[PDB]
Design an enzyme around this catalytic site. Sequence first.
Site, short mmCIF file in Angstrom:
data_model
loop_
_atom_site.label_atom_id
_atom_site.label_comp_id
_atom_site.label_asym_id
_atom_site.label_seq_id
_atom_site.Cartn_x
_atom_site.Cartn_y
_atom_site.Cartn_z
N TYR A 141 0.86 -1.29 0.10
CA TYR A 141 -0.07 -0.02 0.09
C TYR A 141 0.94 1.43 0.08
CZ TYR A 141 -4.12 -3.16 0.92
OH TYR A 141 -5.08 -4.12 0.81
N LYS A 190 3.83 -15.76 2.35
CA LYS A 190 3.70 -16.21 1.13
C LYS A 190 5.19 -16.29 0.70
CE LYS A 190 2.11 -18.37 -2.49
NZ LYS A 190 1.44 -19.55 -2.18
N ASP A 222 -2.61 -18.51 1.36
CA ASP A 222 -3.62 -19.07 0.79
C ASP A 222 -4.48 -20.16 1.56
OD1 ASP A 222 -1.91 -21.28 0.04
OD2 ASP A 222 -1.24 -19.59 -1.51
N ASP A 246 -5.31 -7.35 5.76
CA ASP A 246 -6.47 -6.51 5.30
C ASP A 246 -7.42 -7.22 4.64
OD1 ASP A 246 -8.21 -4.40 4.39
OD2 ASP A 246 -7.02 -4.37 2.57
N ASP A 250 -11.11 -9.30 7.56
CA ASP A 250 -12.32 -9.48 7.07
C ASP A 250 -12.99 -10.73 6.90
OD1 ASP A 250 -11.78 -6.57 6.39
OD2 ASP A 250 -12.82 -6.78 4.45
#
Lengths: 357, 356
Positions: A141, A190, A222, A246, A250
Amino acid sequence: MKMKLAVLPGDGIGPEVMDAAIRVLKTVLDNDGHEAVFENALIGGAAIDEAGTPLPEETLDICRRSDAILLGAVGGPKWDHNPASLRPEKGLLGLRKEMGLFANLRPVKAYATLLNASPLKRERVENVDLVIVRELTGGLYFGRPSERRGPGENEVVDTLAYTREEIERIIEKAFQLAQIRRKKLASVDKANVLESSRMWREIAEETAKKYPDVELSHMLVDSTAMQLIANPGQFDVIVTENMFGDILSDLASVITGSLGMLPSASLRSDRFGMYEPVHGSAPDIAGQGKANPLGTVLSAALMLRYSFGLEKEAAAIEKAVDDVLQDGYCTGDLQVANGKVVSTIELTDRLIEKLNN
Amino acid sequence: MKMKLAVLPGDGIGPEVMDAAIRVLKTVLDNDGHEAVFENALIGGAAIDEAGTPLPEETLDICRRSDAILLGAVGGPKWDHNPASLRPEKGLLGLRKEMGLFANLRPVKAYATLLNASPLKRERVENVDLVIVRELTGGLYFGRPSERRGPGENEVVDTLAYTREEIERIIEKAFQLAQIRRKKLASVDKANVLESSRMWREIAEETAKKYPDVELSHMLVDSTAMQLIANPGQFDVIVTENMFGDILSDLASVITGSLGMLPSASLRSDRFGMYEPVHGSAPDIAGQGKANPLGTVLSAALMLRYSFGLEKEAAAIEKAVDDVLQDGYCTGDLQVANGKVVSTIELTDRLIEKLN
């Protein structure tokens, strides 16, 4: 004992759900022996109104000058038209970086009287008790460059940049968390593809030897997404980078389907923090007192626990918040067992009832 | 019609499952009569052994002269100890790029007779049938620079880079694919932050012109994620970048508990494609003839649809696969009705049966 608090109710229902917080906040304080001096400030649209800026200059003082900040929510159709620079959200993201808060904790624990509200079968979501720890300062970001290059601009790039220090502090704050919970940590990255995740895994591995009683486990981003839906009860504390968090947040925020109930915390190195419910400012409902004070209440309990080490009280609040829900008392939004819909205020009272006898 | 198919079973339950598929085809291509010449090729453990590399140069030739590729799986205990550069798995990613496949599809359809497997409640998982289209040539996965740098080498970086085309093609496909289904296409990105997602949200908006019959929506990657769980029954086709597509796919692989029967198809420009079952090579049970062949067979039906247009030869299979689970037959992993458990082959016999 004595503590100072910065209250920023904000827009929409913000002020209602914050009152519930403050009242119940006092009920347990002077009930245990501790003291505390509040002090409001305007944030978001309300500040835009009486100061021209969603993040007013004096509000920061009230904050810097205090131990913890209790936030409600910002937003609303009104300023929904103002020019970016001047809008509610800008004001909130602002004080976030002004305070230098880099870690966001997401506590997701299941409640017996709400499971029927979950999308998952009773056996997979029941007895779930975890905390997603997301990195807030680094990542894809903030990383530069983020531009379209061309010729003709037939090319673009975004960057995922991190430093040893940003990785080492979010991960360390993580271990300390698990440390005082069920001492089981699971680092999510990852690493099989990104060099950033390799450094992360190398780091989380080093820090591991500075907390011998914490079981560190690695997991690919994943696979953690699947296990959160397949068997989320296996988790305790999860720490992940900016982007991956992020998301895990959620996702983790729906497997219980008990939002407007979820608490949120934003910390940093020391003990200063900003607590706020997860749910938004829900503008088209303010005034009615339909607001669920619970997400903001549980939010307060967290402040007590992470920001002042006052566990008893912290758990007292959530214990109370559990009984009240069992009785069948709730504010409509939740789908409690038999049910017995009351009001923001009526519920705040029942909470003060348990909390006293 | 006529078609040359290269057969790369792999190692483990692969050859077992690849055989179920072959048969089913050899039966189905005699639905409307088509000549199918099968040519086998080594891959992974199989290849390491009698060749020296998990991707013999001879295997690539066979694919190049083929109209499609049927593939089982690689991976084996025996070869998980040698160097990462000569392991079963490296052969696949290579056969992957070597064929220039840039689009991955992975359709997920819930089965009325497999709902007990799902971690979701009937009300939510039922009526599910969709497809995830994952771009395969950009993202952080393949973006430079990507290394550690700075003083004391205490900084790292990965680059999310894409070309106007990479983004354009993966969106055409998803649009035509949406074209022939419920005509819906949810395009997932991070437009509120990433520059890449912005260009993507555009590339998509333009291509929307070219297909006015489709209803194109947009969703931030992090919202699509909880929706796939809170209301996945709303999706038809979804397309997204290489990284988001990796997470989102595996996220759709758990909502049904049908792992043993999810197909996949790596596509590209023309109609050439590589097909395979979503599951791994389960070396553990190789030989016991208890492997579930449905995943690999749905993949064969997929090949027919996308690689040749036999919209019905394929559908015949899909309906077949749905009938046999309807009579209560399954291989073991399946959590059917009072269901009758049978061997990989028996089950195969049940399909060949239904198929006429």
